């Protein structure tokens, strides 16, 4: 299984999560690509991958507003070629705000709708990967059993 990990991150918190996930999924024996949303193109992005792990921060309090680099890709999710592919979502957020890790349910709902198989419940963490290393590790463990 060739995994793509796609992240949108403004201060580096979801990026640290993406990086820890790359390390752990690769360690499990998978070919893994790390891609920042800033340099990604939605059109047929999932071609050649068996699983896509996507995640980003939310920025709109009362409304859901996704991370700037990720939001155009989210809007063009229909073009990625996700039908039949496995998917899991992750996010860094802050519980003081409304829509805590709101990108996770939003990506899961949109992905299901396009024929992707969402492999497990998305990771929701406050702060960066070293603030909650065990939740990151358990989620990676969940994806590895499903790949
Ligand atoms: C104006 C503003 C709005 C925010 N809105 C949300 C939000 O709706 N949900 C959430 O979980 N966090 C929200 N946050 C918190 C950030 O998502 C949090 O700092 C996150 O860890 C940043 O992750 P990143 O560095 O990967 O972009 C907001 C922050 C700011 C400044």
From Swiss-Prot:
<keyword id="KW-0285">Flavoprotein</keyword>
<protein>
    <recommendedName>
        <fullName>Flavodoxin</fullName>
    </recommendedName>
</protein>
<dbReference type="InterPro" id="IPR008254">
    <property type="entry name" value="Flavodoxin/NO_synth"/>
</dbReference>
<dbReference type="GO" id="GO:0009055">
    <property type="term" value="F:electron transfer activity"/>
</dbReference>
<dbReference type="GO" id="GO:0010181">
    <property type="term" value="F:FMN binding"/>
</dbReference>
<comment type="function">
    <text>Low-potential electron donor to a number of redox enzymes.</text>
</comment>
<dbReference type="InterPro" id="IPR029039">
    <property type="entry name" value="Flavoprotein-like_sf"/>
</dbReference>
<keyword id="KW-0249">Electron transport</keyword>
<dbReference type="InterPro" id="IPR050619">
    <property type="entry name" value="Flavodoxin"/>
</dbReference>
<comment type="similarity">
    <text>Belongs to the flavodoxin family.</text>
</comment>
<keyword id="KW-0288">FMN</keyword>
<keyword id="KW-0813">Transport</keyword>
<dbReference type="InterPro" id="IPR010087">
    <property type="entry name" value="Flav_short"/>
</dbReference>
<dbReference type="InterPro" id="IPR001226">
    <property type="entry name" value="Flavodoxin_CS"/>
</dbReference>
<feature type="domain" description="Flavodoxin-like">
    <location>
        <begin position="3"/>
        <end position="144"/>
    </location>
</feature>
<dbReference type="Pfam" id="PF00258">
    <property type="entry name" value="Flavodoxin_1"/>
</dbReference>
